[PDB]
């Protein structure tokens, strides 16, 4: 065995923690390091459903806390009336009215349907790629049939003489 | 070095676990990936690529590791009239005619 | 003048052919040394590079090797016309004749 | 307090460059940041020190006047 | 001679024509051989992109103007246009129209300098179409086996012989032009298939065509000669003879 | 597995699977010499020679950091050709691209070479990383051979060679030891050898033959869960 090379080139400005070039993959790793891994719960019921009475207390505590702190809550309610009416009457059709009136506006639905089909393709990735290889394995085995014929030529020549 | 029993499978395949009541409600969303290391595993991109130049190039690399393989490589690259190293057999013309020239004796 | 060879710095040497018999031997050794060349012994002076598994891009790599061995500076306009062993021999002759007559290298 | 904060925010930019030195230096897509970071840093330092230096001169002009004017009135 | 020339070693006759999609310039000039990692300088110094644009775009553009500075030294560009600009510059504060009338002759001067200092570019596809129609050339040369050994094409300085071209002894034309707008050069060719070489010498001049004021062809080959050399055969092909060409057509005498 | 059912999936307003000339309103229209005064166009006939020079540049400027590795230079050439042969082999009719496919691909490769000249192209950094891991594994095999020791790859081959002899000594009715049978023998050894890397072989039980490894285990005291709560 020949002695291989000691090492290839080592870039002086590229590291695994500080990659030189940018992509969403490295941002994805730094993102999941930040939010941390999936917080797996070992319990048999969720935290919210087991503490509905207690969460109701603190929920109303902070409502009263804000209510006791906000002496002028009626001024905030009245100052919010006009924008509440305005933005809801203006955006009603584009949010909800389109579903039973003049136009459907199915742009957002088309993107869900495309993703649902892509989700299904990824679910059958193993089956689809395995069917593609079976055709390539069929072609590869068809080429290997020639070496099997030549190996027996010596036996044919021996018995022919 | 020890190899164990060829008839048996790894113990990971034989170990099992069963459930009971109560059962954890939590449904796993993703597989954990705490350390980004996937060494000694080949890329899954190398899946259904057709035959190409990398096949005869890597063949010579592995053949040249043996004595008989070194003879095949040197003979093919020198004494075979082919316009490509991507050898495809679609006929037995060169095979049959090479046999009739040898079986006469 | 020095280049890395398998991790070791080795001084590169240049050739000066100035003879028809030496140019043919160099080109054959050049083309046979290429890892994509098929039927290396069937290669002769009148051999089309296409018949030995070589395309337009392989002629660029061969022309690049001629610049390494002979010190030429071959323009991009000349490379695509080198498709036979005879073409490399005649081009090398034309470059030596040009420098022997004009005292300078051809335009690159 | 203002001069000390803005000095620390400028030092924070120097850390951001040092933390990302290899990208700012080798990646040519960040060449403009590499070339013009010191120009902006000098302009930022120039504003921090200018305000401090001008305030220092005015305080000294104020202190020397009230002392001189007070002795005249005495 | 090519006016636009950088330290790049390859493709000298195409340097001004090729429009690269580079954001900035390459770190090094095109290598002539495989180099070592320590031959080139990692992370080029700060303000490298600005330096490259000055030495690869600005500087060779000024060397082009300097090389052909003799074609812009006419009494129109030297005295009339700057003299007109100074007359209106004295009233630049009176109104806006004086600023425009003082800057227009400057922009007009730049355009004449910009066009006259460019490399003389003939329609090379017309030329190769002409030499490949000759049977004596196609016997030894073909487009698929021809290669360029040397190229030269430059304007002729001053006014020519005032017997072969009496057109240029015109005081009105000499006021705008200091040269004759004619060019001369050659082409060193070689054929890798036949082993033959030839020197394609040519002389060009602008001619009028089919219209009253517009030039027909700025580079018309009125003399085209080929000295073909082979193994033991030396042929001399005359595609366009000047004695027969100058009796039919005369130069154009560009103004402005 | 799963096939796209929409028969109009590859339909475009320009035809079936047309990704070379998408249909837009401002369509290309001809020009006439007699009627045209002036024109501003950037198209020329310089793309062919720019295609040749770009290859020479990208090939030579990358070999600068190969340290003379001959096998890496030949591997890079095969990879560089796959990048230049895209317009010649693609399903897309590259000769029918909207405004000249030759110019478009040439300008695309120039952007790649610009990054190559600075040794910052992601293909270059990927080649250095892949080659360093490969040479480290070849140097490991070389240092074990210089010591007279047997490599892990040689022990697999010798173990596979003896299993073939055992399986063919019992195969007398049939005499076709197909490549299918050889493969499943090697794959079964591979699965046990792969599981043996995480759990080495201590005794006759072999690689990953201990049931006690799969009993309840806990993190060591010096390496607790760093990212989340344990309870
Ligand atoms: C000095 C004295 C004062 C201090 C004293 C100390 C007091 C400290 C108080 C803290 C209390 C302990 C903290 C424990 C955790 C927080 C409490 C909790 O409920 O979390 C469990 C709950 C999930 O627990 P789980 O059951 O284990 O999860 C199982 C499934 O995975 C969950 O998902 P699933 O879909 O699979 O399962 C069903 C799911 C269905 O429920 C949901 O999934 C909720 C859907 C909402 C998500 C939709 C997207 C909207 C949010 C996007 C992100 C916004 C934030 C980021 C953007 C801005 C960046 C700043 O869960 C439920 O069944 C119902 C959930 C609970 C009832 C509804 C909760 C309403 C109030 C909580 C949210 C408060 C919002 C802000 C209001 C406060 C003003 C700031 O967490 C949440 O749902 C989100 C809340 C995250 C915490 C933020 C709020 C912290 C403080 C909350 C205090 C109590 C509420 C006070 C206000 C009440 C107003 C009405
Ligand atoms: C050229 C476009 C129109 C221009 C006219 C002016 C603008 C329209 C104003 C009135 C709107 C009514 C028509 C609904 C249009 C909905 C289109 C839509 O929203 O996109 C959905 C669409 C996908 O959602 P989709 O659910 O599949 O759409 C189907 C619809 O849901 C529904 O499915 P569909 O198949 O039935 O839709 C086909 C489309 C067919 O449209 C056409 O083919 C156009 C007609 C041919 C050309 C005629 C115009 C000729 C112009 C030249 C003459 C101008 C002279 C000016 C002076 C000369 C100047 C030199 O709509 C019609 O059928 C129109 C017939 C109207 C029925 C009238 C029946 C009687 C009603 C009586 C009561 C009326 C009460 C109305 C209350 C007030 C209005 C709310 O998104 C896109 O296509 C994105 C690309 C945008 C396309 C180009 C821009 C067109 C305008 C789109 C809005 C802005 C999008 C961009 C921003 C996106 C966010 C960043
Ligand atoms: C509710 C609590 C509220 C409390 C308030 C405080 C909240 C906490 C704040 C925490 C954030 C600040 C952290 C401060 C230090 C804390 C210790 C620590 O970092 O964690 C342990 C940390 C380990 O982190 P880990 O979480 O365990 O794991 C790291 C991961 O594995 C991955 O490793 P990795 O290295 O990639 O991770 C880096 C890691 C830690 O990386 C570090 O090494 C921390 C370096 C922080 C320096 C911040 C700028 C200071 C500039 C230096 C000034 C020196 C003046 C000296 C004057 C006299 C000398 C001439 O993360 C950071 O970089 C944190 C930086 C936070 C962003 C700051 C950017 C500010 C820009 C925006 C301006 C905002 C205005 C405020 C600016 C205030 C400036 C004073 O330990 C180390 O990193 C050891 C480092 C040993 C070598 C460093 C030798 C010194 C080199 C200094 C840089 C020189 C730059 C050029 C000079 C510029 C001025 C001329
Ligand atoms: C403290 C540190 C910083 C200090 C900074 C300040 C210092 C700056 C220093 C600047 C001075 C040195 C730079 C120039 C050195 C050149 C020396 C030399 O020997 O060159 C000879 C060299 C000849 O080379 P050669 O081929 O070896 O000669 C062979 C034979 O001798 C050739 O034989 P030939 O018979 O063919 O003769 C050829 C020759 C013929 O030469 C001549 O015959 C001389 C003609 C000059 C005419 C100038 C007046 C034009 C108007 C007269 C009109 C009078 C009639 C009408 C009167 C109406 C009154 C309203 O051609 C020329 O060289 C003339 C070229 C153009 C010159 C005229 C440029 C006009 C600019 C107008 C604005 C002036 C502002 C000045 C600043 C004052 C205010 C701040 O020519 C050159 O190298 C040309 C260089 C490039 C042209 C430079 C001219 C300036 C261009 C800049 C454009 C902007 C102008 C200013 C505009 C500002 C307001 C917008
Ligand atoms: C009166 C005192 C002097 C007045 C101030 C003069 C300032 C002139 C410089 C600032 C304006 C420059 C214009 C920028 C926009 C164009 C960029 C450009 O030039 O591209 C080059 C272009 C490059 O050509 P291109 O842009 O068409 O592209 C080349 C084609 N490819 C890409 C295919 C290769 O060339 C030219 O335009 C011709 C030369 C123009 C010369 C520019 C001005 C030089 C002036 C020299 C003054 C020297 C004395 C002063 C300094 C002395 C030392 C202190
Ligand atoms: N038929 C045309 N239609 C549209 N634009 C054109 C046309 N011909 C030229 N152009 C543009 O005008 C420029 C000059 O054309 P020109 O013929 O001088 O180029 P050239 O490279 O010198 O050709 P040649 O090699 O034959 O001499 C071209 O770069 C092009 O952008
Ligand atoms: Mg031209």
mmCIF file with all atom_site columns, N, CA and C in Angstrom, chain A residues 16 25-26 29 38-47 125 129 132-133 136 143 146 149-150 153 157 161, chain B residues 22-30 36 44 47-50 87-92 95 99 102-103 105:
data_model
loop_
_atom_site.group_PDB
_atom_site.id
_atom_site.type_symbol
_atom_site.label_atom_id
_atom_site.label_alt_id
_atom_site.label_comp_id
_atom_site.label_asym_id
_atom_site.label_entity_id
_atom_site.label_seq_id
_atom_site.pdbx_PDB_ins_code
_atom_site.Cartn_x
_atom_site.Cartn_y
_atom_site.Cartn_z
_atom_site.occupancy
_atom_site.B_iso_or_equiv
_atom_site.pdbx_formal_charge
_atom_site.auth_seq_id
_atom_site.auth_comp_id
_atom_site.auth_asym_id
_atom_site.auth_atom_id
_atom_site.pdbx_PDB_model_num
ATOM 1   N N  . UNK A 1 16  ? -16.239 25.146  11.450  1.00 0.00 ? 16  UNK A N  1
ATOM 2   C CA . UNK A 1 16  ? -17.554 24.533  11.564  1.00 0.00 ? 16  UNK A CA 1
ATOM 3   C C  . UNK A 1 16  ? -18.510 25.430  12.339  1.00 0.00 ? 16  UNK A C  1
ATOM 4   N N  . UNK A 1 25  ? -29.217 26.487  6.382   1.00 0.00 ? 25  UNK A N  1
ATOM 5   C CA . UNK A 1 25  ? -28.948 25.308  7.194   1.00 0.00 ? 25  UNK A CA 1
ATOM 6   C C  . UNK A 1 25  ? -28.239 25.694  8.482   1.00 0.00 ? 25  UNK A C  1
ATOM 7   N N  . UNK A 1 26  ? -27.232 26.557  8.383   1.00 0.00 ? 26  UNK A N  1
ATOM 8   C CA . UNK A 1 26  ? -26.515 26.984  9.575   1.00 0.00 ? 26  UNK A CA 1
ATOM 9   C C  . UNK A 1 26  ? -27.393 27.855  10.458  1.00 0.00 ? 26  UNK A C  1
ATOM 10  N N  . UNK A 1 29  ? -29.521 25.527  12.508  1.00 0.00 ? 29  UNK A N  1
ATOM 11  C CA . UNK A 1 29  ? -28.852 24.936  13.657  1.00 0.00 ? 29  UNK A CA 1
ATOM 12  C C  . UNK A 1 29  ? -28.736 25.931  14.803  1.00 0.00 ? 29  UNK A C  1
ATOM 13  N N  . UNK A 1 38  ? -37.011 19.787  21.560  1.00 0.00 ? 38  UNK A N  1
ATOM 14  C CA . UNK A 1 38  ? -38.407 19.542  21.880  1.00 0.00 ? 38  UNK A CA 1
ATOM 15  C C  . UNK A 1 38  ? -38.570 19.190  23.352  1.00 0.00 ? 38  UNK A C  1
ATOM 16  N N  . UNK A 1 39  ? -39.404 19.956  24.053  1.00 0.00 ? 39  UNK A N  1
ATOM 17  C CA . UNK A 1 39  ? -39.615 19.786  25.490  1.00 0.00 ? 39  UNK A CA 1
ATOM 18  C C  . UNK A 1 39  ? -40.600 18.647  25.708  1.00 0.00 ? 39  UNK A C  1
ATOM 19  N N  . UNK A 1 40  ? -40.059 17.435  25.791  1.00 0.00 ? 40  UNK A N  1
ATOM 20  C CA . UNK A 1 40  ? -40.881 16.246  25.938  1.00 0.00 ? 40  UNK A CA 1
ATOM 21  C C  . UNK A 1 40  ? -41.415 16.160  27.359  1.00 0.00 ? 40  UNK A C  1
ATOM 22  N N  . UNK A 1 41  ? -42.718 15.983  27.483  1.00 0.00 ? 41  UNK A N  1
ATOM 23  C CA . UNK A 1 41  ? -43.368 15.850  28.777  1.00 0.00 ? 41  UNK A CA 1
ATOM 24  C C  . UNK A 1 41  ? -43.505 14.377  29.138  1.00 0.00 ? 41  UNK A C  1
ATOM 25  N N  . UNK A 1 42  ? -43.182 13.975  30.365  1.00 0.00 ? 42  UNK A N  1
ATOM 26  C CA . UNK A 1 42  ? -43.346 12.574  30.758  1.00 0.00 ? 42  UNK A CA 1
ATOM 27  C C  . UNK A 1 42  ? -44.702 12.236  31.352  1.00 0.00 ? 42  UNK A C  1
ATOM 28  N N  . UNK A 1 43  ? -45.607 13.200  31.451  1.00 0.00 ? 43  UNK A N  1
ATOM 29  C CA . UNK A 1 43  ? -46.861 13.005  32.150  1.00 0.00 ? 43  UNK A CA 1
ATOM 30  C C  . UNK A 1 43  ? -47.938 12.433  31.241  1.00 0.00 ? 43  UNK A C  1
ATOM 31  N N  . UNK A 1 44  ? -49.052 12.070  31.869  1.00 0.00 ? 44  UNK A N  1
ATOM 32  C CA . UNK A 1 44  ? -50.173 11.439  31.202  1.00 0.00 ? 44  UNK A CA 1
ATOM 33  C C  . UNK A 1 44  ? -51.252 12.432  30.805  1.00 0.00 ? 44  UNK A C  1
ATOM 34  N N  . UNK A 1 45  ? -51.186 13.656  31.320  1.00 0.00 ? 45  UNK A N  1
ATOM 35  C CA . UNK A 1 45  ? -52.072 14.732  30.921  1.00 0.00 ? 45  UNK A CA 1
ATOM 36  C C  . UNK A 1 45  ? -51.254 15.999  30.738  1.00 0.00 ? 45  UNK A C  1
ATOM 37  N N  . UNK A 1 46  ? -51.771 16.901  29.914  1.00 0.00 ? 46  UNK A N  1
ATOM 38  C CA . UNK A 1 46  ? -51.062 18.137  29.651  1.00 0.00 ? 46  UNK A CA 1
ATOM 39  C C  . UNK A 1 46  ? -51.096 19.044  30.877  1.00 0.00 ? 46  UNK A C  1
ATOM 40  N N  . UNK A 1 47  ? -50.162 19.993  30.909  1.00 0.00 ? 47  UNK A N  1
ATOM 41  C CA . UNK A 1 47  ? -50.042 20.871  32.066  1.00 0.00 ? 47  UNK A CA 1
ATOM 42  C C  . UNK A 1 47  ? -51.252 21.782  32.211  1.00 0.00 ? 47  UNK A C  1
ATOM 43  N N  . UNK A 1 125 ? -41.273 8.577   0.112   1.00 0.00 ? 125 UNK A N  1
ATOM 44  C CA . UNK A 1 125 ? -39.976 8.733   -0.534  1.00 0.00 ? 125 UNK A CA 1
ATOM 45  C C  . UNK A 1 125 ? -39.258 7.399   -0.660  1.00 0.00 ? 125 UNK A C  1
ATOM 46  N N  . UNK A 1 129 ? -38.252 5.917   -4.460  1.00 0.00 ? 129 UNK A N  1
ATOM 47  C CA . UNK A 1 129 ? -36.852 5.782   -4.835  1.00 0.00 ? 129 UNK A CA 1
ATOM 48  C C  . UNK A 1 129 ? -36.467 4.318   -4.972  1.00 0.00 ? 129 UNK A C  1
ATOM 49  N N  . UNK A 1 132 ? -37.489 3.256   -8.409  1.00 0.00 ? 132 UNK A N  1
ATOM 50  C CA . UNK A 1 132 ? -36.583 3.803   -9.410  1.00 0.00 ? 132 UNK A CA 1
ATOM 51  C C  . UNK A 1 132 ? -35.295 2.998   -9.494  1.00 0.00 ? 132 UNK A C  1
ATOM 52  N N  . UNK A 1 133 ? -34.807 2.502   -8.357  1.00 0.00 ? 133 UNK A N  1
ATOM 53  C CA . UNK A 1 133 ? -33.576 1.723   -8.355  1.00 0.00 ? 133 UNK A CA 1
ATOM 54  C C  . UNK A 1 133 ? -33.789 0.324   -8.909  1.00 0.00 ? 133 UNK A C  1
ATOM 55  N N  . UNK A 1 136 ? -32.974 0.407   -12.394 1.00 0.00 ? 136 UNK A N  1
ATOM 56  C CA . UNK A 1 136 ? -31.536 0.503   -12.609 1.00 0.00 ? 136 UNK A CA 1
ATOM 57  C C  . UNK A 1 136 ? -30.825 -0.784  -12.229 1.00 0.00 ? 136 UNK A C  1
ATOM 58  N N  . UNK A 1 143 ? -26.434 -6.347  -17.735 1.00 0.00 ? 143 UNK A N  1
ATOM 59  C CA . UNK A 1 143 ? -25.076 -6.234  -18.246 1.00 0.00 ? 143 UNK A CA 1
ATOM 60  C C  . UNK A 1 143 ? -24.147 -7.260  -17.620 1.00 0.00 ? 143 UNK A C  1
ATOM 61  N N  . UNK A 1 146 ? -23.221 -11.138 -19.207 1.00 0.00 ? 146 UNK A N  1
ATOM 62  C CA . UNK A 1 146 ? -22.178 -11.478 -20.166 1.00 0.00 ? 146 UNK A CA 1
ATOM 63  C C  . UNK A 1 146 ? -20.960 -12.101 -19.498 1.00 0.00 ? 146 UNK A C  1
ATOM 64  N N  . UNK A 1 149 ? -21.463 -15.790 -18.874 1.00 0.00 ? 149 UNK A N  1
ATOM 65  C CA . UNK A 1 149 ? -21.345 -16.670 -20.029 1.00 0.00 ? 149 UNK A CA 1
ATOM 66  C C  . UNK A 1 149 ? -19.887 -16.994 -20.313 1.00 0.00 ? 149 UNK A C  1
ATOM 67  N N  . UNK A 1 150 ? -19.003 -16.010 -20.163 1.00 0.00 ? 150 UNK A N  1
ATOM 68  C CA . UNK A 1 150 ? -17.596 -16.221 -20.473 1.00 0.00 ? 150 UNK A CA 1
ATOM 69  C C  . UNK A 1 150 ? -16.923 -17.137 -19.464 1.00 0.00 ? 150 UNK A C  1
ATOM 70  N N  . UNK A 1 153 ? -17.030 -20.659 -20.611 1.00 0.00 ? 153 UNK A N  1
ATOM 71  C CA . UNK A 1 153 ? -16.418 -21.019 -21.884 1.00 0.00 ? 153 UNK A CA 1
ATOM 72  C C  . UNK A 1 153 ? -15.267 -21.992 -21.694 1.00 0.00 ? 153 UNK A C  1
ATOM 73  N N  . UNK A 1 157 ? -15.016 -25.564 -23.544 1.00 0.00 ? 157 UNK A N  1
ATOM 74  C CA . UNK A 1 157 ? -13.865 -25.943 -24.350 1.00 0.00 ? 157 UNK A CA 1
ATOM 75  C C  . UNK A 1 157 ? -13.220 -27.217 -23.826 1.00 0.00 ? 157 UNK A C  1
ATOM 76  N N  . UNK A 1 161 ? -13.341 -31.010 -26.190 1.00 0.00 ? 161 UNK A N  1
ATOM 77  C CA . UNK A 1 161 ? -12.141 -31.707 -26.623 1.00 0.00 ? 161 UNK A CA 1
ATOM 78  C C  . UNK A 1 161 ? -11.870 -32.877 -25.686 1.00 0.00 ? 161 UNK A C  1
ATOM 79  N N  . UNK B 2 22  ? -51.281 4.040   32.822  1.00 0.00 ? 22  UNK B N  1
ATOM 80  C CA . UNK B 2 22  ? -51.473 5.163   31.901  1.00 0.00 ? 22  UNK B CA 1
ATOM 81  C C  . UNK B 2 22  ? -50.340 5.328   30.906  1.00 0.00 ? 22  UNK B C  1
ATOM 82  N N  . UNK B 2 23  ? -50.602 6.089   29.848  1.00 0.00 ? 23  UNK B N  1
ATOM 83  C CA . UNK B 2 23  ? -49.627 6.302   28.786  1.00 0.00 ? 23  UNK B CA 1
ATOM 84  C C  . UNK B 2 23  ? -49.314 7.786   28.622  1.00 0.00 ? 23  UNK B C  1
ATOM 85  N N  . UNK B 2 24  ? -48.048 8.166   28.472  1.00 0.00 ? 24  UNK B N  1
ATOM 86  C CA . UNK B 2 24  ? -47.715 9.577   28.244  1.00 0.00 ? 24  UNK B CA 1
ATOM 87  C C  . UNK B 2 24  ? -48.507 10.175  27.092  1.00 0.00 ? 24  UNK B C  1
ATOM 88  N N  . UNK B 2 25  ? -49.081 11.358  27.318  1.00 0.00 ? 25  UNK B N  1
ATOM 89  C CA . UNK B 2 25  ? -49.870 11.987  26.268  1.00 0.00 ? 25  UNK B CA 1
ATOM 90  C C  . UNK B 2 25  ? -49.007 12.565  25.155  1.00 0.00 ? 25  UNK B C  1
ATOM 91  N N  . UNK B 2 26  ? -47.739 12.858  25.432  1.00 0.00 ? 26  UNK B N  1
ATOM 92  C CA . UNK B 2 26  ? -46.940 13.660  24.517  1.00 0.00 ? 26  UNK B CA 1
ATOM 93  C C  . UNK B 2 26  ? -46.628 12.909  23.235  1.00 0.00 ? 26  UNK B C  1
ATOM 94  N N  . UNK B 2 27  ? -46.795 13.593  22.111  1.00 0.00 ? 27  UNK B N  1
ATOM 95  C CA . UNK B 2 27  ? -46.475 13.057  20.799  1.00 0.00 ? 27  UNK B CA 1
ATOM 96  C C  . UNK B 2 27  ? -45.190 13.710  20.315  1.00 0.00 ? 27  UNK B C  1
ATOM 97  N N  . UNK B 2 28  ? -44.202 12.894  19.974  1.00 0.00 ? 28  UNK B N  1
ATOM 98  C CA . UNK B 2 28  ? -42.925 13.421  19.520  1.00 0.00 ? 28  UNK B CA 1
ATOM 99  C C  . UNK B 2 28  ? -43.087 14.124  18.181  1.00 0.00 ? 28  UNK B C  1
ATOM 100 N N  . UNK B 2 29  ? -42.547 15.336  18.090  1.00 0.00 ? 29  UNK B N  1
ATOM 101 C CA . UNK B 2 29  ? -42.638 16.143  16.883  1.00 0.00 ? 29  UNK B CA 1
ATOM 102 C C  . UNK B 2 29  ? -41.481 15.869  15.932  1.00 0.00 ? 29  UNK B C  1
ATOM 103 N N  . UNK B 2 30  ? -40.252 15.975  16.425  1.00 0.00 ? 30  UNK B N  1
ATOM 104 C CA . UNK B 2 30  ? -39.064 15.772  15.620  1.00 0.00 ? 30  UNK B CA 1
ATOM 105 C C  . UNK B 2 30  ? -38.136 14.794  16.317  1.00 0.00 ? 30  UNK B C  1
ATOM 106 N N  . UNK B 2 36  ? -24.328 17.696  15.789  1.00 0.00 ? 36  UNK B N  1
ATOM 107 C CA . UNK B 2 36  ? -24.368 17.621  14.333  1.00 0.00 ? 36  UNK B CA 1
ATOM 108 C C  . UNK B 2 36  ? -23.173 16.809  13.843  1.00 0.00 ? 36  UNK B C  1
ATOM 109 N N  . UNK B 2 44  ? -27.261 10.196  0.904   1.00 0.00 ? 44  UNK B N  1
ATOM 110 C CA . UNK B 2 44  ? -28.428 9.611   0.266   1.00 0.00 ? 44  UNK B CA 1
ATOM 111 C C  . UNK B 2 44  ? -28.730 10.232  -1.091  1.00 0.00 ? 44  UNK B C  1
ATOM 112 N N  . UNK B 2 47  ? -28.337 7.941   -5.123  1.00 0.00 ? 47  UNK B N  1
ATOM 113 C CA . UNK B 2 47  ? -29.464 7.022   -5.079  1.00 0.00 ? 47  UNK B CA 1
ATOM 114 C C  . UNK B 2 47  ? -29.768 6.355   -6.414  1.00 0.00 ? 47  UNK B C  1
ATOM 115 N N  . UNK B 2 48  ? -30.079 7.128   -7.450  1.00 0.00 ? 48  UNK B N  1
ATOM 116 C CA . UNK B 2 48  ? -30.522 6.564   -8.719  1.00 0.00 ? 48  UNK B CA 1
ATOM 117 C C  . UNK B 2 48  ? -29.852 7.266   -9.882  1.00 0.00 ? 48  UNK B C  1
ATOM 118 N N  . UNK B 2 49  ? -28.569 7.535   -9.753  1.00 0.00 ? 49  UNK B N  1
ATOM 119 C CA . UNK B 2 49  ? -27.812 8.112   -10.850 1.00 0.00 ? 49  UNK B CA 1
ATOM 120 C C  . UNK B 2 49  ? -27.457 7.013   -11.838 1.00 0.00 ? 49  UNK B C  1
ATOM 121 N N  . UNK B 2 50  ? -27.538 7.330   -13.125 1.00 0.00 ? 50  UNK B N  1
ATOM 122 C CA . UNK B 2 50  ? -27.193 6.367   -14.153 1.00 0.00 ? 50  UNK B CA 1
ATOM 123 C C  . UNK B 2 50  ? -25.681 6.157   -14.218 1.00 0.00 ? 50  UNK B C  1
ATOM 124 N N  . UNK B 2 87  ? -18.055 0.999   -20.904 1.00 0.00 ? 87  UNK B N  1
ATOM 125 C CA . UNK B 2 87  ? -18.269 -0.187  -21.718 1.00 0.00 ? 87  UNK B CA 1
ATOM 126 C C  . UNK B 2 87  ? -19.687 -0.705  -21.529 1.00 0.00 ? 87  UNK B C  1
ATOM 127 N N  . UNK B 2 88  ? -20.424 -0.825  -22.628 1.00 0.00 ? 88  UNK B N  1
ATOM 128 C CA . UNK B 2 88  ? -21.783 -1.342  -22.617 1.00 0.00 ? 88  UNK B CA 1
ATOM 129 C C  . UNK B 2 88  ? -21.847 -2.492  -23.606 1.00 0.00 ? 88  UNK B C  1
ATOM 130 N N  . UNK B 2 89  ? -22.257 -3.662  -23.129 1.00 0.00 ? 89  UNK B N  1
ATOM 131 C CA . UNK B 2 89  ? -22.396 -4.847  -23.966 1.00 0.00 ? 89  UNK B CA 1
ATOM 132 C C  . UNK B 2 89  ? -23.842 -4.953  -24.431 1.00 0.00 ? 89  UNK B C  1
ATOM 133 N N  . UNK B 2 90  ? -24.072 -4.715  -25.717 1.00 0.00 ? 90  UNK B N  1
ATOM 134 C CA . UNK B 2 90  ? -25.381 -4.913  -26.318 1.00 0.00 ? 90  UNK B CA 1
ATOM 135 C C  . UNK B 2 90  ? -25.377 -5.983  -27.398 1.00 0.00 ? 90  UNK B C  1
ATOM 136 N N  . UNK B 2 91  ? -24.240 -6.631  -27.639 1.00 0.00 ? 91  UNK B N  1
ATOM 137 C CA . UNK B 2 91  ? -24.135 -7.681  -28.639 1.00 0.00 ? 91  UNK B CA 1
ATOM 138 C C  . UNK B 2 91  ? -22.996 -8.605  -28.240 1.00 0.00 ? 91  UNK B C  1
ATOM 139 N N  . UNK B 2 92  ? -23.058 -9.841  -28.732 1.00 0.00 ? 92  UNK B N  1
ATOM 140 C CA . UNK B 2 92  ? -22.043 -10.841 -28.425 1.00 0.00 ? 92  UNK B CA 1
ATOM 141 C C  . UNK B 2 92  ? -21.159 -11.073 -29.641 1.00 0.00 ? 92  UNK B C  1
ATOM 142 N N  . UNK B 2 95  ? -17.657 -11.308 -28.490 1.00 0.00 ? 95  UNK B N  1
ATOM 143 C CA . UNK B 2 95  ? -17.508 -12.465 -27.618 1.00 0.00 ? 95  UNK B CA 1
ATOM 144 C C  . UNK B 2 95  ? -17.488 -13.763 -28.415 1.00 0.00 ? 95  UNK B C  1
ATOM 145 N N  . UNK B 2 99  ? -14.269 -16.472 -29.568 1.00 0.00 ? 99  UNK B N  1
ATOM 146 C CA . UNK B 2 99  ? -14.290 -17.884 -29.217 1.00 0.00 ? 99  UNK B CA 1
ATOM 147 C C  . UNK B 2 99  ? -14.008 -18.782 -30.409 1.00 0.00 ? 99  UNK B C  1
ATOM 148 N N  . UNK B 2 102 ? -10.369 -19.169 -31.107 1.00 0.00 ? 102 UNK B N  1
ATOM 149 C CA . UNK B 2 102 ? -9.621  -19.915 -30.107 1.00 0.00 ? 102 UNK B CA 1
ATOM 150 C C  . UNK B 2 102 ? -9.996  -21.385 -30.045 1.00 0.00 ? 102 UNK B C  1
ATOM 151 N N  . UNK B 2 103 ? -11.246 -21.728 -30.361 1.00 0.00 ? 103 UNK B N  1
ATOM 152 C CA . UNK B 2 103 ? -11.693 -23.116 -30.287 1.00 0.00 ? 103 UNK B CA 1
ATOM 153 C C  . UNK B 2 103 ? -11.259 -23.947 -31.483 1.00 0.00 ? 103 UNK B C  1
ATOM 154 N N  . UNK B 2 105 ? -8.209  -24.673 -32.318 1.00 0.00 ? 105 UNK B N  1
ATOM 155 C CA . UNK B 2 105 ? -7.113  -25.519 -31.889 1.00 0.00 ? 105 UNK B CA 1
ATOM 156 C C  . UNK B 2 105 ? -7.528  -26.500 -30.811 1.00 0.00 ? 105 UNK B C  1
#
